[PDB]
C-alpha cells in the first residue's frame, strides 16, 4: 500500500512542478524590473547625497568588468527602512 | 551438510543475531534482481526542480518539440500507468 | 557610470492577481501563453543582462493580461469556485481541492 | 471501581486537547480563514514576497481575485 | 571581510592561546582543542553558506568527523596517564626539552 | 538592524573566554555548551540549519557528555571555579578586555587594523538572493555526499573503523 | 522572531519558578541540616574517583558511532539523487563498516560494558 | 499575538503533567487492586495542586557541600528543554513549521540528560555521583539506536519535516510497514525517558531516589515535572510518527480529538508497564542494547534503505 | 597485539601518507595527515610502558595542535581565494601559518622539542619508523607549495634547526636521543634548500632515509641503546660495530662517503642564488653535527671499553631473525658517491 | 612529490570537489561562477608564473566577487556620508510608503 500511495504522490508532485515551472518566467520578469527599478532609484538618491563630495564618480561599478552582476542584496537595500531590510534577508528564515 | 546443522544451533542460541544476518545480507543481494530499480532511477530523471531552458531553433533537429506540446519529446505516461 | 534604463522606460502595468488564484489557472497559462514566454527566457539565458530582454519582459506581461481577459468574460464563477477552494490551504496543494477543477476545466474546455 | 479512573483521565485529555485547538484556530483567526501558510523553501516565501505588496493592505491574508486586473 | 568573520577568527586565536597557556591536569587541553575545532568548523560553514559553493556543503561535517575523531582518541591516552597518577601535566617522565 | 547574529558572535567569543581559561574541565564543558548553542544559532542565521543542528546534536549532544565522563575519572577534590584563582580569573578578565576592545572598534566603524582588515558594518550586507525551487541549497548540497562523492565516504569509513581498532589497541594493553 | 521568543518565555518561566521556590518558605536553614545525605551516618569522604576502564571502553564506542550516524543523516535526501547505483553501494557501505566496527568489538572482548 | 499562542501551549501542558501524576497513581493503583488517591478529590481530582503546594511551600535547603550555581541551573534546564521540545509538534498544525524539526526533537532530547549529569555532579553526594553516572550511561547507550531507527523510519516519509509525516500516513499507517522498528522505538522511548523496566536513574531501592535525592522542594518538583514532560512528549511523538489519521483541513479540531486519544493510549501503557516488570540492572540494561537491539536496528536499516530502490517507491519530498 | 592487526595499522599509515602524496584537493591532504595520526599513535604503544604512554602523549598533543593550525590556515586561504587546489596561497597571514604547521610536522626548531623526547619513549622499531616515514608527508606537501613560501621564514627555521640540531647533540649519552638530534639536524638541510630547488631536497631526503635505516637496523641488530651498552659490542660480532663507524661517518659527510652528496649539491644550488653566506654558516655548523658522531664512534669501534664477563656465554649464540633489507641499506648509503649525476633522474 | 596517479589513471576521484563551478548537483550556480569561469579560461598554457601577471585583473574582479570588499567600503562611505546630511537633507519619502509595494 505504501508503494501505491507513494508513487501516486510522486505523480501529483511532478505535476506541481509543472505548475510552478509554468508560473516562473513572468516572476523572472517582475523581479527583473523591480531590481533595475530599485537600483535606479538608489542611484538617484546617490546623486543627491554624495553630490556634496567634491570627488566622487557616481554609480561607478567597482569592477573592470562590463558585465552585469546581479547586485548583492546589501547595496540594493542601501537606504531602506530597517523593517524593509528585516523583510529582505532574515525574512525567510525568521518566518515560521 | 554439517554446516547446515549449526544453523540449528545458532538459531537455538542467538536468534536475534541470526535474523539480523538474514535480512541484513538479503537486503544487499536482492536489489539488483528487481526490475523496478531501473524505473526507480528513471523517476528521478522525470522530476525537474530546475527550469527547462529552451533551445534556439536551428534547422529541424527535430526531436525537440516546439511548443505547445509537440509530440516529439519524451513520453511520460508510462509513468502515469504506474 | 554603469548604463541603466530610465525609471520610466521599464514601467509597465503589473499583473496583480494573487498567487493562489494565479496558480489555480497557471496550469493552463503555460499551455496557452507560450511563444513570447519561451522567447523571453531563451532571450534571457542567452545574453545574461536583463536590460537586453526587458522589452520581451514587457511583452510577456501584456500577453498574460490578454490571457486573463480571455478568462474573465467566460469562466469566472466556476473559476472563483476553484481558486477559493485552493487558497484555503497554505500548502497550496492541488490534491486538497481537485473536484472543482472538474467544473473549471470543463467550463473552459467547452465554453472557451 | 475502575471506571472511576475516568475523571482523572478525561481531565488529561481536555488539557492536551487545548493547544491542538488553540493554535489551529488562532491561525485562522489571524489569517482570515486562510489556514496559515508554510514556507519551507525560498520559492514559497517568494510567493509571500510577491504577495503582501500586491494586496494594498500589507497583511497578505487577502487574495485579490480577477477583479484586481480591472 | 565582514566583522563577524573577524570575531570568529579571534575566537580561534583564543581557542589556541588557551591550549598553549596550558596548565595543571591536561584534560583542559583536550577541551580547548575541541573548542578550536568548533571555531574552525563554524568559520568554514559560514563560508560555504556564503558563496553558494554547494559541493562544499559536504566538507564541514566531514571536517567535524575526523576532528572529533582524534579528540575521541585523545581521551583514551588521558585514561592511561590518569591510570597511573590521577592526572596532572605537572608530572612528566621524559627528559630533555 | 538587530545585529543579532553579531551579538551572538560576541557571546560566542566570551564563551571561549570563559572556556579557554582553564578552571576544571567541567565548567569548561559548560563553556562549550554555551558556545555550542550560540554556535548553532549563528550558523542557523544563514540558514544552513541542518549543519547547525549537526553541531548542536553531534557535538554537544555527544562530546561534552563523554567529557562529563572524563571528569568522573579525573576530578580531584576541590575543583576550581573561575573565581578560585588569580591567574584563572585574571585570564578571564584578560579575554574580556580584548574582545571588548574589538567591540569598541566596531563602534569606531573603521576597518580593523589588527592582523588583517575587517570590513565592518552589519552582517546582512553580504547576503545575496537565495532564489531556488522547492529545495534548499544545503539539502541536495549534502545529499551529494553519497552519490557524487564516494571517495570521502570511503576514507571516512576506513578511518573511523580503524579508529575503533586503535581504541582497542590502547585500552586492551592494560 | 519566533523561536527565540519561545525560548525566552520558557526560560523565564522556569527561572520564575525557581525564585518563587526559594524566596517563599522563609524558614531556618542551619548546619547539619544542610550536611550532605549519606543514609544516616556521615560520609567517610567527599566524592573522589569511581574509576573504571569499563566506562570509556564502551563510551568511546558511543562517540564513534554517533559520528557515524552523523553521516547517516544525509541519506533521506541523498535517496532522491539522479544516480542511485552510484550511491547505493555507499549507502550500504558505511552501515557495513558500522556493523563491522561493532563486530570487531563484539569478539575482541572489548565490549564488556557494565 | 503569537505570544498568547505560546502561553497557550505552555499552561495546558503543565496542567497535563499534574493530572498525569494523578492518573499515574490512579491506574497504577488499580493494577494493585488498591484504589489510588481518592479521599481529597472527591475523585482525587484536586490532589495534584495540593501536592505541588505542599512542595513549594516546603523549605528547599541549599546544601552546605554543594556548589550552588550548577545546583540551581540544572532544574531550570530540565523544565526548559522539557517544554521546548513541544514547540514543533504538529497538532495538526505545528506551532512552528521547522523544515527538519524531528532532528530537533533529537537535539533537545540529547541535551536533556546532560542536566542529569550536572544534577548528580553538583549534588556532591556519593549516591548522587554514582547514580548520575550510570544514568548517563544508559541514556546515551539508548540514544544511538534511538536516532538510527528513527532515521530508518524516516527514509520513507520523505523528509525531516513533521507535517509531511501526516501526509504520508493518509491511509495504512507507518506501523504496518515497519513495526519492528516501532518496537525498538517504543522501548528506546521506554529507556530514554527513564521508565519502568529501565528504571536506573531514580535508582529507587537500588540507590534511594538516585541523582534526584539532594534536591529538596522546588527543584525536585522541577525534575519530577520535567520527567513527566518527556514521558507524555515522547508518547505523543510516537503517536504522530507511527499512527496516522484522517485529516480534513476544514475541521482540524476533529484530528486533534483523535490524536490525544492515540497518544494517551500510549502514555497509559507506560504505567501499565510500570506495574509489571522488575528493573534490568545496569549490566543487562546495556547488554540487550549493544548486543541485541542494535544489530537488528542495522539490518532493518539497510533493508529500509533498500526497499525504496527495489520497490521503486521513493517518497516525494525534495 | 597480534600481527594481523599490527600490519593493518602500519599499512593504513602507509595509506595515510600515500593519500597525501596523491590527492590534489587540500581537504584530502588534511585528511591524509589526520588519518596518519590515528594510525601512528597505537604503534607507539606496543609493549607498553609507563614511559611510553607519556611519550605518545607528547606526540599526539603536538601533532594535534599542528593539524589544527594547518586546517585553520587552509580555511583562511579559501576565504581569500575560494579555492581548494594546492597551488599558490593567496594570503601571507595564512601562508605563514601553513608554514608553521608543517614546521611542527617536521619537528623543525624551535618547534622541535618534542622529537628528542618522543624518540626516547619508544623501541627502535617504532623509532625508526617515526623518524623516516613520518618525514615524508609534510615534505610531500612542502614540495607542492615551494612556489610561494616566504623564503625568509623558511631559511630561519632551516638554520635554527641546524644549530639546535647541533648543540643538543653533543650532550647526550643514550643513542636514541642522539638519533633524534641527528634527524632534527638533517631536516634543517632539507628544508633549507626547499625554496630554491626541490629536487635537491628530495635527493637529500632519500639519502637521509637510507642512512637512518642503516643505523636503526644496526642498533636493532645489536640491541644497543645507552652508549655504554653499545660499547660492549666490539667483542661480540665485531663487524657491526666496525660498520657503525662507517655509517656514522656517512652521517658526518666526510667527502668520499655518500652522505657528502647531499651537502655538496645543496651548496651548489644555493650558490647559484648567490646567498653565499648562508651555506658557509650552515656547512660550518654541520661540522659540529659531526663531532658527536665521532665521539660516539669512540665509545664503540675504534676503542674497546671494558667487557663484562657475563658476555662470554653469549658468544656461543648467533644472532637470528636476519633483516634482509639491511646490507643494501648500508651500501647505498655509503659507496654511491660517484653516482650523483643519476640524481637528475629525479628531474 | 605530487604524484598525480589519479590523473594518469583518469580516476578523477578527487578532482570534482575542486573549483566553484565544475558541475554541481541540480546545476546550482556558484555565487561567483562567472568571474571564476573567465579567470580559469584565461589560465592554461600560461601556467602559474606568468599567470599571476596577465590574469591579475580577472582574479581581482573575482576577489571582489568573493568578498564584496570594495563595494562595502563604498557603501559604507555613502551611509556615513548621509549622517552629515541628515539635518541638511530629508532623503526620500517613498521608501516609507512608495510604489515599491505596488511595484510587483
Ligand atoms: C541554565 C540556563 C538554562 C537555559 C536553557 C536554554 C537552552 C536553549 C538552547 C537551544 C538552542 C537551539 C536553537 C535552534 C532552533 C532551530 O534550529 O530553529 C529551526 C529553524 C528551521 O528553519 P528552516 O525551516 O530551516 O527555514 C525556514 C523555516 N521558516 O531555524 C530557523 O529558521 C530560525 C533561526 C533563528 C536562530 C535562533 C537561534 C537561537 C540560538 C540561541 C543559543 C543561546 C545559548 C545560550 C544558553 C545559555 C545556557 C547557560
Ligand atoms: C656558530 C656555529 C659555527 C660553529 C663554529 C665552529 C664549529 C666547530 C667545532 C665543533 C666541535 C667543537 C667542540 C665539540 C666537542 C668538545 O666540546 O670537546 C671538548 C673536550 C673537553 O673534554 P670533555 O669532552 O668535556 O670531557 C673530558 C673527558 N676526558 O675536549 C675537546 O675535545 C676539545 C678539542 C676538540 C675540538 C677542537 C677543534 C679545533 C677547533 C675547531 C674550529 C677551528 C677552526 C679552524 C681554523 C681555521 C679557520 C677558518
What does this structure look like?
This is part of a larger assembly, with 10 protein chains of 10 kinds. Chain F has about 170 residues and is an all-alpha fold. Chain F has one domain: Four Helix Bundle (Hemerythrin (Met), subunit A) (Up-down Bundle). Chain F has helices at about 5-20, 25-45, 50-75, 85-110, 135-145, 150-170. In chain F, helix 1 packs antiparallel against helix 2, helix 1 runs antiparallel to helix 4 and helix 2 (about 25-45) packs antiparallel against helix 3. Chain F is flat. By secondary structure, chain H is mainly α. Chain H has helices at about 1-30, 45-55, 70-85, 100-110, 115-120, 125-155, 165, 175-190, 220-240, 250-275, 280-310. In chain H, helix 3 (about 70-85) packs parallel to helix 9 (about 220-240), helix 6 (about 125-155) runs antiparallel to helix 8 and helix 8 (about 175-190) packs antiparallel against helix 9 (about 220-240). The longest helix of chain H has 29 residues, at about 1-30. In chain I, about 65% of the residues lie in helices and about 0% in strands. Chain I has helices spanning about 5-20, 25-40, 50-80, 90-105, 115-120, 125-130, 135-140, 150-165, 175-195, 200-220, 225-230, 240-250, 260-270, 275-300, 310-315, 325-330. Chain I is globular, with a radius of gyration of 20 Å. The termini of chain I are far apart. Chain J is mainly α. Chain J has helices spanning about 5-10, 35-40, 50-55, 55-65, 70-85, 95. Chain B: Belongs to the complex I NDUFA3 subunit family. Chain B: This is NADH dehydrogenase [ubiquinone] 1 alpha subcomplex subunit 3. Chain B: Complex I is composed of 45 different subunits. Chain B: It is found in: Mitochondrion inner membrane. Chain H: One of its GO terms (molecular function) is NADH dehydrogenase (ubiquinone) activity.
Strand % of chain D is under 5%
Please outline the major beta sheet of chain D. Answer: none
- For the termini of chain I, the CA-CA separation is 42 Å
- Any idea what the shape of chain I is? globular
Can you summarize the main beta sheet of chain I? none
Number of domains of chain D: 1
Enumerate the distinct ligands: 1,2-dioleoyl-sn-glycero-3-phosphoethanolamine
**Could you spell the SSE succession of chain D in H and E letters?**
HH
- Helix content bin of chain D: 40-55%
The gross shape of chain D turns out to be elongated
**Total beta-strand segments of chain D:** 0
Gyration radius of chain I, in Å: 20 Å
Query: Tally of extended strands of chain I?
Result: 0
- Provide the structure class of chain I: mainly alpha
Distance between termini of chain D?
Answer: 71 Å
Q: How much helicity do the residues of chain I have?
A: 55-70%
| Class per helix and strand makeup of chain D | mainly alpha
> What order do the SSEs of chain I take from the amino end to the carboxyl end, as H and E?
HHHHHHHHHHHHHHHH
Q: Total helix count of chain D?
A: 2
Strand content of chain I: under 5%
PDB class: electron transport
Keywords: Cryo-EM, Mammalian, Respiratory, Supercomplex, electron transport
Entry title: Cryo-EM structure of mammalian respiratory supercomplex I1III2IV1
Chain A: NADH dehydrogenase [ubiquinone] 1 alpha subcomplex subunit 13
Amino acid at each position: 500500500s505504501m508503494m501505491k500511495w507513494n508513487r501516486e504522490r510522486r505523480r501529483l508532485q511532478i505535476e506541481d512542478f509543472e505548475a510552478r515551472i509554468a508560473l516562473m518566467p513572468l516572476f523572472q520578469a517582475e523581479k527583473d524590473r523591480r531590481v533595475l527599478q530599485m537600483l535606479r532609484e538608489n542611484l538617484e538618491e546617490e546623486a543627491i547625497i554624495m553630490k556634496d563630495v567634491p570627488d566622487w564618480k557616481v554609480g561607478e561599478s567597482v569592477f573592470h568588468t562590463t558585465r552585469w552582476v546581479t547586485p548583492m542584496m546589501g547595496e540594493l537595500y542601501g537606504l531602506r527602512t530597517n523593517e524593509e531590510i528585516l523583510s529582505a534577508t532574515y525574512g525567510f528564515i525568521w518566518y515560521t | 551438510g554439517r554446516i547446515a546443522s549449526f544453523l540449528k544451533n545458532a538459531w537455538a542460541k542467538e536468534p536475534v543475531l541470526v535474523a539480523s544476518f538474514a535480512i541484513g545480507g538479503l537486503a544487499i543481494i536482492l536489489p539488483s534482481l528487481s526490475p523496478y530499480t531501473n524505473y526507480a532511477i528513471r523517476i528521478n530523471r522525470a522530476t525537474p526542480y530546475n527550469y527547462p531552458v529552451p533551445l534556439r531553433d536551428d534547422g529541424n533537429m527535430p526531436d525537440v518539440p516546439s511548443h505547445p506540446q509537440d509530440p516529439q519529446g519524451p513520453s511520460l505516461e508510462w509513468l502515469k500507468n504506474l | 557610470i554603469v548604463e541603466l534604463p530610465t525609471l520610466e522606460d521599464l514601467k509597465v502595468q503589473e499583473v496583480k492577481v494573487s498567487s493562489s488564484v494565479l496558480k489555480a489557472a497557471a496550469h493552463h497559462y503555460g499551455a496557452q501563453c507560450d511563444k513570447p514566454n519561451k522567447e523571453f527566457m531563451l532571450c534571457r539565458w542567452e545574453e545574461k543582462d536583463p536590460r537586453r530582454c526587458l522589452e520581451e519582459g514587457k511583452l510577456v506581461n501584456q500577453c498574460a493580461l490578454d490571457f486573463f481577459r480571455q478568462i474573465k468574460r467566460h469562466c469566472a464563477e466556476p473559476f472563483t469556485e476553484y481558486w477559493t477552494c485552493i487558497d484555503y490551504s497554505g500548502l497550496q496543494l492541488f490534491r486538497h481541492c481537485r473536484k472543482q477543477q472538474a467544473k473549471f476545466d470543463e467550463c473552459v474546455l467547452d465554453k472557451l | 471501581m475502575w471506571f472511576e479512573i475516568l475523571p482523572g483521565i478525561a481531565v488529561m485529555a481536555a488539557c492536551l486537547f487545548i493547544p491542538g485547538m488553540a493554535t489551529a484556530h488562532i491561525h485562522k483567526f489571524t489569517n482570515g480563514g486562510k489556514e496559515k501558510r508554510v514556507a519551507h523553501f525560498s520559492y514559497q516565501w517568494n510567493l509571500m514576497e510577491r504577495d503582501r505588496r500586491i494586496s494594498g493592505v500589507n497583511r497578505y491574508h487577502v487574495t485579490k481575485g480577477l477583479e484586481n486586473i480591472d | 571581510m565582514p566583522l563577524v568573520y573577524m570575531n570568529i577568527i579571534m575566537a580561534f586565536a583564543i581557542a589556541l592561546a588557551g591550549l598553549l597557556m596550558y596548565r595543571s591536569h591536561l584534560m583542559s587541553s583536550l577541551l580547548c582543542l575541541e573548542g578550536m575545532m568548533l571555531s574552525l568548523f563554524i568559520m568554514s560553514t559560514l563560508i560555504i553558506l556564503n558563496t553558494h559553493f554547494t559541493l562544499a556543503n559536504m566538507m564541514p561535517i566531514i571536517l567535524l568527523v575526523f576532528a572529533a575523531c582524534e579528540a575521541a582518541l585523545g581521551l583514551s591516552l588521558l585514561v592511561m596517564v590518569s591510570n597511573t597518577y590521577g592526572t596532572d601535566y605537572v608530572q612528566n617522565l621524559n627528559l630533555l626539552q | 538592524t538587530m545585529y543579532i547574529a553579531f551579538i551572538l558572535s560576541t557571546i560566542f567569543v566570551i564563551g571561549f573566554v570563559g572556556f579557554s581559561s582553564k578552571p576544571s574541565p567541567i565548567y569548561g564543558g559548560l563553556g562549550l555548551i554555551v558556545s555550542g548553542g550560540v554556535g548553532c544559532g549563528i550558523v542557523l542565521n544563514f540558514g544552513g540549519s541542518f549543519l547547525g543542528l549537526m553541531v548542536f546534536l553531534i557535538y554537544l549532544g555527544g562530546m561534552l557528555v563523554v567529557f562529563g565522563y572524563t571528569t568522573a575519572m579525573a576530578t580531584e577534590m576541590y575543583p576550581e571555579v573561575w573565581v578560585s584563582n588569580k591567574t584563572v580569573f585574571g585570564a578571564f578578565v584578560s579575554g574580556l578586555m580584548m574582545e571588548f576592545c574589538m567591540v569598541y572598534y566596531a563602534l569606531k566603524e573603521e576597518e580593523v587594523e589588527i592582523i588583517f582588515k575587517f570590513n565592518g558594518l552589519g552582517d546582512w550586507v553580504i547576503y545575496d538572493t537565495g532564489d531556488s525551487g522547492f529545495f534548499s541549497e544545503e539539502a541536495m548540497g549534502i545529499a551529494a555526499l553519497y552519490s557524487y562523492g564516494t571517495w570521502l565516504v570511503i576514507v571516512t569509513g576506513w578511518s573511523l573503523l580503524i579508529g575503533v581498532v586503535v581504541i582497542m589497541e590502547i585500552t586492551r594493553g592494560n | 522572531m519566533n523561536i527565540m521568543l519561545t525560548l525566552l518565555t520558557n526560560v523565564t518561566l522556569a527561572s520564575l519558578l525557581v525564585l518563587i521556590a526559594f524566596w517563599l518558605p522563609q524558614l531556618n536553614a542551619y548546619s547539619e541540616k544542610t550536611s550532605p545525605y549519606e543514609c544516616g551516618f556521615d560520609p567517610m569522604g567527599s566524592a573522589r574517583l569511581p574509576f573504571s576502564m569499563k566506562f570509556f571502553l564502551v563510551a568511546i564506542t558511543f562517540l564513534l558511532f554517533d559520528l557515524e550516524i552523523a553521516l547517516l543523516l544525509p541519506l533521506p535526501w541523498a535517496s532522491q539523487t539522479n544516480n542511485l547505483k552510484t550511491m547505493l553501494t555507499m549507502a550500504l557501505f558505511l552501515l557495513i563498516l558500522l556493523a563491522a566496527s561493532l563486530a570487531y568489538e563484539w569478539t575482541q572482548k572489548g565490549l564488556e560494558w557494565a | 499575538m503569537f505570544m498568547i499562542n505560546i502561553l497557550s501551549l505552555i499552561i495546558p501542558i503543565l496542567l497535563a503533567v499534574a493530572f498525569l501524576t494523578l492518573v499515574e497513581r490512579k491506574v497504577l493503583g488499580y493494577m494493585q487492586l488498591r484504589k489510588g488517591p481518592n479521599v481529597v478529590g472527591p475523585y482525587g481530582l484536586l490532589q495534584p495542586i495540593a501536592d505541588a503546594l505542599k512542595l513549594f511551600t516546603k523549605e528547599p535547603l541549599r546544601p552546605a557541600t554543594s556548589s550552588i550555581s550548577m545546583f540551581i541551573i540544572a532544574p531550570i534546564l530540565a523544565l526548559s528543554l522539557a517544554l521546548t521540545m513541544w514547540v514543533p509538534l504538529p497538532m495538526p498544525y505545528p506551532l512552528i513549521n521547522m523544515n527538519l524539526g524531528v532532528l530537533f526533537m533529537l537535539a533537545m532530547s540529547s541535551l536533556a540528560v546532560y542536566s542529569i549529569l550536572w544534577s548528580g555532579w553538583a549534588s556532591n553526594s556519593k549516591y548522587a555521583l554514582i547514580g548520575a553516572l550510570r544514568a548517563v550511561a544508559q541514556t546515551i547507550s539508548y540514544e544511538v539506536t534511538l536516532a538510527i531507527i528513527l532515521l530508518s523510519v524516516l527514509l520513507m516519509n520523505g523528509s525531516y519535516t513533521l507535517s509531511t509525516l501526516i501526509t504520508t500516513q493518509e491511509h495504512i499507517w507507518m506501523i504496518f510497514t515497519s513495526w519492528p522498528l516501532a518496537m525498538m522505538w517504543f522501548i528506546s522511548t521506554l529507556a530514554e525517558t527513564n521508565r519502568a523496566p529501565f528504571d536506573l536513574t531514580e535508582g529507587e531501592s537500588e540507590l534511594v531516589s538516585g541523582f534526584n535525592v539532594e534536591y529538596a522542594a522546588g527543584p525536585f518538583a522541577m525534575f519530577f515535572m520535567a520527567e513527566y514532560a518527556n514521558i507524555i512528549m515522547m508518547n505523543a511523538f510516537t503517536a504522530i510518527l507511527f499512527l496516522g489519521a484522517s485529516h480534513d483541513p476544514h475541521t482540524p479540531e476533529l484530528y486533534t480529538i483523535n490524536f490525544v486519544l492515540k497518544t494517551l493510549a500510549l502514555t497509559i501503557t507506560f504505567l501499565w508497564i510500570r506495574a509489571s516488570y522488575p528493573r534490568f540492572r545496569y549490566d543487562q540494561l546495556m547488554h540487550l542494547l549493544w548486543k541485541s537491539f542494535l544489530p537488528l536496528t542495522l539490518a532493518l536499516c539497510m533493508w529500509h534503505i533498500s526497499l525504496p530502490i527495489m520497490t521503486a517507491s521513493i517518497p516525494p519530498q525534495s | 597485539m597480534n600481527p594481523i592487526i599490527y600490519t593493518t595499522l602500519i599499512m593504513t599509515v602507509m595509506s595515510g601518507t600515500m593519500l597525501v602524496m596523491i590527492s590534489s584537493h587540500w581537504l584530502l591532504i588534511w585528511i591524509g595527515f589526520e588519518m596518519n595520526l590515528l594510525a601512528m599513535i597505537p604503534v607507539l604503544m606496543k609493549n607498553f610502558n609507563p614511559r611510553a604512554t607519556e611519550a605518545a602523549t607528547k606526540y599526539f598533543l603536538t601533532q594535534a595542535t599542528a593539524s589544527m593550525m594547518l586546517m585553520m590556515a587552509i580555511i583562511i586561504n579559501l576565504l581569500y581565494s575560494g579555492q581548494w587546489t594546492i597551488t599558490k596561497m593567496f594570503n601571507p597571514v595564512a601562508m605563514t601559518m601553513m608554514t608553521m604547521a608543517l614546521a611542527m610536522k617536521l619537528g623543525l626548531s624551535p618547534f622541535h622539542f618534542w622529537v628528542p623526547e618522543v624518540t626516547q619513549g619508544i623501541s627502535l622499531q617504532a623509532g625508526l619508523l617515526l623518524l623516516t616515514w613520518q618525514k615524508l608527508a609534510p615534505l610531500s606537501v612542502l614540495c607542492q607549495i615551494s612556489q610561494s613560501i616566504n623564503p625568509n621564514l623558511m631559511l630561519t627555521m632551516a638554520m635554527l634547526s641546524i644549530l639546535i640540531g647541533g648543540w643538543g647533540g653533543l650532550n647526550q649519552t643514550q643513542l636514541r636521543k642522539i638519533m633524534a638530534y641527528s634527524s632534527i639536524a638533517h631536516m634543517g638541510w632539507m628544508t633549507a634548500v626547499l625554496p630554491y630547488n626541490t629536487t635537491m631536497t628530495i635527493l637529500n631526503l632519500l639519502i637521509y632515509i637510507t642512512m637512518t635505516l642503516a643505523m636503526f637496523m644496526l642498533l636493532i641488530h645489536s640491541s644497543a641503546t645507552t652508549t655504554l651498552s653499545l660499547s660492549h659490542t666490539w667483542n661480540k660480532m665485531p663487524v657491526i660495530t666496525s660498520l657503525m663507524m662507517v655509517t656514522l661517518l656517512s652521517m658526518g659527510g666526510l667527502p668520499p662517503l655518500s652522505g657528502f652528496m647531499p651537502k655538496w649539491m645543496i651548496i651548489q644550488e644555493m650558490t647559484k642564488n648567490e646567498s653565499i653566506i648562508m651555506p658557509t654558516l650552515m656547512a660550518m655548523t654541520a661540522l659540529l653535527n659531526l663531532y658527536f658522531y665521532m665521539r660516539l664512534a669512540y665509545s664503540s669501534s675504534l676503542t674497546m671499553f671494558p667487557s663484562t664477563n657475563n658476555m662470554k656465554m653469549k658468544w656461543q649464540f648467533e644472532h637470528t631473525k636476519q633483516m634482509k633489507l639491511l646490507p643494501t641499506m648500508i651500501v647505498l648509503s655509503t659507496l654511491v658517491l660517484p653516482m650523483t649525476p643519476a640524481l637528475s633522474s629525479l628531474n | 612529490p605530487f604524484f598525480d596517479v589519479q590523473k594518469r589513471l583518469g580516476l578523477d576521484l578527487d578532482r570534482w570537489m575542486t573549483i566553484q563551478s565544475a558541475e554541481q548537483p541540480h546545476k546550482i550556480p556558484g555565487r561567483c561562477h562567472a568571474f571564476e569561469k573567465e579567470w580559469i579560461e584565461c589560465a592554461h598554457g600560461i601556467g602559474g608564473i606568468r599567470a599571476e601577471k596577465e590574469c591579475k585583473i580577472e582574479f581581482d574582479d573575482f576577489v571582489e566577487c568573493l568578498l564584496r570588499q570594495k563595494t562595502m567600503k563604498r557603501l559604507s562611505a555613502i551611509k556615513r556620508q548621509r549622517d552629515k546630511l541628515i539635518k541638511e537633507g530629508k532623503y526620500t519619502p517613498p521608501p516609507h510608503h512608495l510604489g515599491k509595494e505596488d511595484p510587483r
